Amino acid sequence: SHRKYEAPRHGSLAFLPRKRAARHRGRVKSFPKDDPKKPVHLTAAMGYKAGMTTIVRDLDRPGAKAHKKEVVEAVTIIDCPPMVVVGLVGYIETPRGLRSLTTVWAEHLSDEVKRRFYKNWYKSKKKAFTKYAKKYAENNGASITRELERIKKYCTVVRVLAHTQIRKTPLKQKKAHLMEIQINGGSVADKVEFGRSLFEKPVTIDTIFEKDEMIDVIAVTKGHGFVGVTARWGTKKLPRKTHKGLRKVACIGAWHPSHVQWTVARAGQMGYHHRTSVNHKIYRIGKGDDEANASTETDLTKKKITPMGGFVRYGEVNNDYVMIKGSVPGVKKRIMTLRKSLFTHTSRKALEKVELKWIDTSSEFGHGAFQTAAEKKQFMGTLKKDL
Amino acid sequence: APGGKLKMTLGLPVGAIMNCADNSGARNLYIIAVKGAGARLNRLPAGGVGDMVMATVKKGKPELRKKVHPAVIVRQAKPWKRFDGVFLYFEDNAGVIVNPKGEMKGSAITGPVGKEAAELWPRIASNAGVVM
RNA sequence: GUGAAGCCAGAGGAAACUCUGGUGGAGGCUCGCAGCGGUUCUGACGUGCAAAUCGAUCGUCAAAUCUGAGCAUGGGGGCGAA
RNA sequence: AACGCGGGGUUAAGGUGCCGGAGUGGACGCUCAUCAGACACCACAAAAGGCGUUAGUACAUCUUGACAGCAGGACGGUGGCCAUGGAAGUCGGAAUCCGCUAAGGACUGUGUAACAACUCACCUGCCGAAUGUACUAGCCCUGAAAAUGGAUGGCGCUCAAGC
RNA sequence: ACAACCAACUUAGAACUGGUACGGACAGGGGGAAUCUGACUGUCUAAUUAAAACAUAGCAUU
RNA sequence: GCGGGUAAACGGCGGGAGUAACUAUGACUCUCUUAAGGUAGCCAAAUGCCUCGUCAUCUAAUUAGUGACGCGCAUGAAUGGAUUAACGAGAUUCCCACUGUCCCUAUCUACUAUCUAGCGAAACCACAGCCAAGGGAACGGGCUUGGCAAAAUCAGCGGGGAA
RNA sequence: CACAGGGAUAACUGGCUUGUGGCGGCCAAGCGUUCAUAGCGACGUCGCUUUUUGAUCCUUCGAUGUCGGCUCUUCCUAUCAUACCGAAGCAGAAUUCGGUAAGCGUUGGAUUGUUCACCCACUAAUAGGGAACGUGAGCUGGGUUUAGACCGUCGUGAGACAGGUUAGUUUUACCCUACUGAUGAACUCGUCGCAAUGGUAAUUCAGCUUAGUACGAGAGGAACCGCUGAUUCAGAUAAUUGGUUUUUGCGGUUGUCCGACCGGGCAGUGCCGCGAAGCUACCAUCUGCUGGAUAAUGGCUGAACGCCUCUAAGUCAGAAUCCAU
Ligand SMILES: [Mg+2]
Ligand SMILES: [Mg+2]
Ligand SMILES: [Mg+2]
Ligand SMILES: [Mg+2]
Ligand SMILES: [Mg+2]
Ligand SMILES: [Mg+2]
Ligand SMILES: [Mg+2]
Ligand SMILES: [Mg+2]
Ligand SMILES: [Mg+2]
Ligand SMILES: [Mg+2]
Ligand SMILES: [Mg+2]
Ligand SMILES: [Mg+2]
Ligand SMILES: [Mg+2]
Ligand SMILES: [Mg+2]
Ligand SMILES: [Mg+2]
Ligand SMILES: [Mg+2]
Ligand SMILES: [Mg+2]
Ligand SMILES: [Mg+2]
Ligand SMILES: [Mg+2]
Ligand SMILES: [Mg+2]
Ligand SMILES: [Mg+2]
Ligand SMILES: [Mg+2]
Ligand SMILES: [Mg+2]
Ligand SMILES: [Mg+2]
Ligand SMILES: [Mg+2]
Ligand SMILES: [Mg+2]
Ligand SMILES: [Mg+2]
Ligand SMILES: [Mg+2]
Ligand SMILES: [Mg+2]
Ligand SMILES: [Mg+2]
Ligand SMILES: [Mg+2]
Ligand SMILES: [Mg+2]
Ligand SMILES: [Mg+2]
Ligand SMILES: [Mg+2]
Ligand SMILES: [Mg+2]
Ligand SMILES: [Mg+2]
Ligand SMILES: [Mg+2]
Ligand SMILES: [Mg+2]
Ligand SMILES: [Mg+2]
Ligand SMILES: [Mg+2]
Ligand SMILES: [Mg+2]
Ligand SMILES: [Mg+2]
Ligand SMILES: [Mg+2]
Ligand SMILES: [Mg+2]
Ligand SMILES: [Mg+2]
Ligand SMILES: [Mg+2]
Ligand SMILES: [Mg+2]
Ligand SMILES: [Mg+2]
Ligand SMILES: [Mg+2]
Ligand SMILES: [Mg+2]
Ligand SMILES: [Mg+2]
Ligand SMILES: [Mg+2]
Ligand SMILES: [Mg+2]
Ligand SMILES: [Mg+2]
Ligand SMILES: [Mg+2]
Ligand SMILES: [Mg+2]
Ligand SMILES: [Mg+2]
Ligand SMILES: [Mg+2]
Ligand SMILES: [Mg+2]
Ligand SMILES: [Mg+2]
Ligand SMILES: [Mg+2]
Ligand SMILES: [Mg+2]
Ligand SMILES: [Mg+2]
Ligand SMILES: [Mg+2]
Ligand SMILES: [Mg+2]
Ligand SMILES: [Mg+2]
Ligand SMILES: [Mg+2]
Ligand SMILES: [Mg+2]
Ligand SMILES: [Mg+2]
Ligand SMILES: [Mg+2]
Ligand SMILES: [Mg+2]
Ligand SMILES: [Mg+2]
Ligand SMILES: [Mg+2]
Ligand SMILES: [Mg+2]
Ligand SMILES: [Mg+2]
Ligand SMILES: [Mg+2]
Ligand SMILES: [Mg+2]
Ligand SMILES: [Mg+2]
Ligand SMILES: [Mg+2]
Ligand SMILES: [Mg+2]
Ligand SMILES: [Mg+2]
Ligand SMILES: [Mg+2]
Ligand SMILES: [Mg+2]
Ligand SMILES: [Mg+2]
Ligand SMILES: [Mg+2]
Ligand SMILES: [Mg+2]
Ligand SMILES: [Mg+2]
Ligand SMILES: [Mg+2]
Ligand SMILES: [Mg+2]
Ligand SMILES: [Mg+2]
Ligand SMILES: [Mg+2]
Ligand SMILES: [Mg+2]
Ligand SMILES: [Mg+2]
Ligand SMILES: [Mg+2]
Secondary structure, three states, X not given: OOOOOOOOOOXXXXXXOOXXXXXXXXXXXXXXXXXXXXOOEEXXXXXXXXXXXXXXXXXXXXXXXXXXXXXEEEEEEEEOXXXXXXXXXXXXXXXXXXXXXXXXXXXXXXXXXXXXXXXOHHHOOOOOOHHHHHHHOHHHOXXXXXXXXXXXXXXXXXXXXXXXOHHHOOOOOOOOOEEEEEEEOOOHHHXXXXXXXXXXXXXXXXXXXXXXXXXXXXXXXXXXXXXXXXHHOOOOOOOOOOOOOOOOOOOOOOOOOXXXXXXXXXXXXXXXXXXXXXXXXXXXXXXXXXOOOOOOOOOOOOOOOXXXXXXXXXXXXXXXXXXXXXXXXXXXXXXXXXXXOOOOOOOHHHHOOOOEEEEXXXXXOOOOOOOOHHHHHHHHOOOHHHO | OOOOOOOOXXXXXXXXXXXXXXXXXXXXXXXXXXXXXXXXXXXXXXXXXXOEEEEEEOOEXXXXXXXXXXXXXXXXXXXXXXXXXOEEOOOOOEEEEEOOOOOEOOOOEOOOEOHHHHHHOHHHHHHOOOEO
């Protein structure tokens, strides 16, 4: 008989294989559509999630209730030391899809990126690209020029192989993250020239993104272990007097199909899923060398983005950072993949220019009531430890 | 139902008894429904400061008892925040009896009134004292 | 815990018997521990610790209360507040 | 079609596009379905309807020429008889005869304080071989709505591999 | 009529004091307005029924 | 057999037709039958079917509760009627208090489950184990036609095995 | 209460049937001021459906757990709402009928075990159904309901009642498959990729402006674009707020024990206040795209059929649809 009272199904079947993500690093499954009339530019970047904080700003939204009034907004911080471009990959079209025809590497690769090619780097001979390095000396780079010319002649998609400078982060990991970033704009020859000129060179995130831009964040979400249906799918708890467990789904299928169906909520892995969250506004791109990168026009105190006592379980953001409105998937220390938006933005919320007024830097480790150590000293006065 | 109201924490579900902040003669208001409530299985309709509800008078004058009245919640004890980021709450839950058009049955309001009710209902704003 | 008869003293009134402090220690009375029982969770367990147990919560708890040993009643018989 | 164990030949019912042994065999037609159809028993369908093919009846034109696509004419007693300030065909009703024209009625409707101009029946005239009506029954279509995904057996098949 | 010596606890009153707290754990009644029903205490289906069933005093009959 | 007694013995305790200056009902009457025709009381009650009876109250809303009403299918006097303070691990309705019963879930602790060393059963078992449709003993894991289909595995799970 | 059996034979699923129940069609006397066919609609007649109940007894009586509710998924369309269209006895507004349409939703409560129903209220709407009358090794046990018990009627009685009432044990998964996740041999080991195939997601409302304007004698009174919010759903996240406390972190405090103090033990976490970290809440915050092909319909050109005609050849647009991103 029919279900007595109508109700929508719990959860979405669009994310249905609720399994652990295949790879820790987020995967850019689609790059923004290329336009040859635009100047050559990278379409993505990598960073590391440092934490969240609070900002205050005057809202510029005519017709809104909070128009021209202060609003408090949560933002996320991504520590973004400059990436190093180390390679080029050319892609050709085929009746079976895109395929990489060839890739060209820089003459010298650092140990950070060489660690990515090893499981036991400590006890290895570290011979990762030793024979390949000789191609730049043999015949005056004839093979390198040959591969670059092949990419120019045949390939229609050009990507750079770039890696993070994870040693500039407070992370204990020494193995860098390496990924392909598509070059958009210009001709294929322009793309190849741009990528080759960027070889073993640092690119900073302000050359890729800019303030008030809407971007996407790709990452693997926070992992929970084996989780029951109540939390995994949001089902209703069964009554208190239920025998053999109330944290369940009462009926997991009718009789006639005679199988448990794929659409029925079941206990299993929760979290640690690959997610591409979209439409996140960049509120600020702060520089590492700026001693007041968390200061404001109306807040002139010279302070950096790091909260008092440091980001909890991260450390200090000593490098360039991006400020993103709202939250992004993934825990702290996670490798974030920032991608340019695939959408066209016309709404005033997306097109608004954001002017910060104050950035919270109080302690994340408790009910922090002070923004700076000098403010703490001024408020408390002299202590016993000051002698 | 009020228009333009921003999302806020709803503190009073159906079945809640709140104080009567006006001088209509009712002592309390027993919420039986909320105007903007949608449809969802098992979910009790709930209202916050500044939205219209349907209520009955459990304690008060006999010619106000035993009937259904429109009412507006003027303050609630459940903490909530506005776009300014400040979480605030009142000492008690209280509302006032109004017409379906939003005109108060009483002529005075006792105690403070949340800003949402004053902004959304001009009669309550005119009859109110301290706002937020 | 309550406080029945009986008893002491003092107040009224006219009588007769009214009242007020005490004393006393009755009741198949009452709260409640052990014991005895077994209401609910329709809890645990339900190839159990257990062919009836375990936990919490409950009924009764000075008498139609609980209990040992000896003895009697033996199958269409016994015994039965049934 | 009834049965011992084998070899060869020929058949029955049923099949010959592939699965599948044997025909993308031959002849003449019909059908296009945004639910085709293809199952003797048998596994779903009816009353009612639709310009595709055939057929039966009657009709028009037979050059004196059909339907469709066009210009022009409705003369003259005629204010006829009743009705009226006034309606001469076009308020009210019963009725429209003709001396000169291939065709024009005291008139089919329009107009109008009375009119008049205008219009129709019809035809001399442009033309040029096929036309209209109502039926009959083949195929197809509408009628034709149920629950896991799905069954001319499947694939597929349209100068069929359907009827 | 006071002084001295001896001896436990039980009750009452006051000041001060702090965390406005104090039967600080433990221990330890939720209460009220009514209806049906059996008067009450008590008893039974050990191992699905504790009840309004049985018993009871009282009443009546033989 | 006959004839008397006996209901705190078993038990029983009725139908029909008119009737009051409008009227409704029927105090009253006329009439058929029994052993006697339900008296005092009580009631949609643990006893009333129709029925969620009718009125009032309780609620925003009450097939529930209570108070009334009574031609009561089928209430009723030691087969005891009515009432009743006190008592009740008896059944029922409401009110205050209270709270995760719920909105709507979250979190913490111990012991399991889990992995390891050691020890180590039982139920059950035609053969076995992916489906869809068809036909079939009218609900197939096996048959027909299709979809398909890749070792060996661990924790859960309660659709199926008409377990 | 027992035994031997029976699916030779009833109660529940399924199967055939469809009287009955439900839902349509054809005809059209008549209604509809006028007018059969805007919309209804008699007499008659053709059907469909298996969400009614009958009829049958084919399967099961060496047992397929028998009502309802809760929970959860999916499917159907005979569409309640939402999208786009056509017609009116459609001036506007509000309605009504019909087409393409099942993508997306279809609620909170009082009484009742209910099913069904009826009220209160919200809502865009509170549509109807199937899945062994879906779903008991998922629950529960209110109903049916063995044994205890009461009443009424019936019976001489033991006892009966498709009458009322009260109390009445809900067992087992560790196997196979299915499902949810998790490893993994072989093709040297790694890094970076591609994308067959499978899944797929958003939903509805309100306010402002348009505008007291179009339309209307007047009462009254749209809409397109644009702006701002909100409901339901989904995916994340913890700056803030709230919850949680074995941080047994700090403090307070009861009893007892260590002779007193200090400092501690015990009361399975003694209790109380605060309590970071972590987890977590529409109890908190963030985010949720546009291309193609179409259906109904509206058209262009244009025959059949010298005229016409959206159609026959060809072709334009077009839905919450379909297929992709
Ligand atoms: Mg949740
Ligand atoms: Mg249970
Ligand atoms: Mg913190
Ligand atoms: Mg006693
Ligand atoms: Mg005991
Ligand atoms: Mg139990
Ligand atoms: Mg167990
Ligand atoms: Mg026990
Ligand atoms: Mg407990
Ligand atoms: Mg032979
Ligand atoms: Mg032979
Ligand atoms: Mg042939
Ligand atoms: Mg062959
Ligand atoms: Mg041929
Ligand atoms: Mg032929
Ligand atoms: Mg065609
Ligand atoms: Mg057809
Ligand atoms: Mg056949
Ligand atoms: Mg026909
Ligand atoms: Mg024909
Ligand atoms: Mg076919
Ligand atoms: Mg065949
Ligand atoms: Mg063939
Ligand atoms: Mg042929
Ligand atoms: Mg006290
Ligand atoms: Mg007690
Ligand atoms: Mg008793
Ligand atoms: Mg005894
Ligand atoms: Mg027993
Ligand atoms: Mg027995
Ligand atoms: Mg018992
Ligand atoms: Mg009487
Ligand atoms: Mg009585
Ligand atoms: Mg009665
Ligand atoms: Mg009643
Ligand atoms: Mg009574
Ligand atoms: Mg009653
Ligand atoms: Mg109630
Ligand atoms: Mg009632
Ligand atoms: Mg009553
Ligand atoms: Mg009687
Ligand atoms: Mg009697
Ligand atoms: Mg008598
Ligand atoms: Mg009696
Ligand atoms: Mg008596
Ligand atoms: Mg009493
Ligand atoms: Mg286990
Ligand atoms: Mg072991
Ligand atoms: Mg075997
Ligand atoms: Mg099958
Ligand atoms: Mg079948
Ligand atoms: Mg079958
Ligand atoms: Mg089998
Ligand atoms: Mg096969
Ligand atoms: Mg396998
Ligand atoms: Mg299990
Ligand atoms: Mg099973
Ligand atoms: Mg079996
Ligand atoms: Mg049979
Ligand atoms: Mg029928
Ligand atoms: Mg019709
Ligand atoms: Mg049937
Ligand atoms: Mg049968
Ligand atoms: Mg059977
Ligand atoms: Mg069997
Ligand atoms: Mg079964
Ligand atoms: Mg229910
Ligand atoms: Mg339809
Ligand atoms: Mg419609
Ligand atoms: Mg759907
Ligand atoms: Mg609602
Ligand atoms: Mg059925
Ligand atoms: Mg069922
Ligand atoms: Mg089951
Ligand atoms: Mg069960
Ligand atoms: Mg059931
Ligand atoms: Mg029961
Ligand atoms: Mg019984
Ligand atoms: Mg009974
Ligand atoms: Mg019962
Ligand atoms: Mg009991
Ligand atoms: Mg796909
Ligand atoms: Mg006008
Ligand atoms: Mg979440
Ligand atoms: Mg906190
Ligand atoms: Mg916290
Ligand atoms: Mg604690
Ligand atoms: Mg401490
Ligand atoms: Mg101590
Ligand atoms: Mg000790
Ligand atoms: Mg304790
Ligand atoms: Mg706290
Ligand atoms: Mg045309
Ligand atoms: Mg065409």
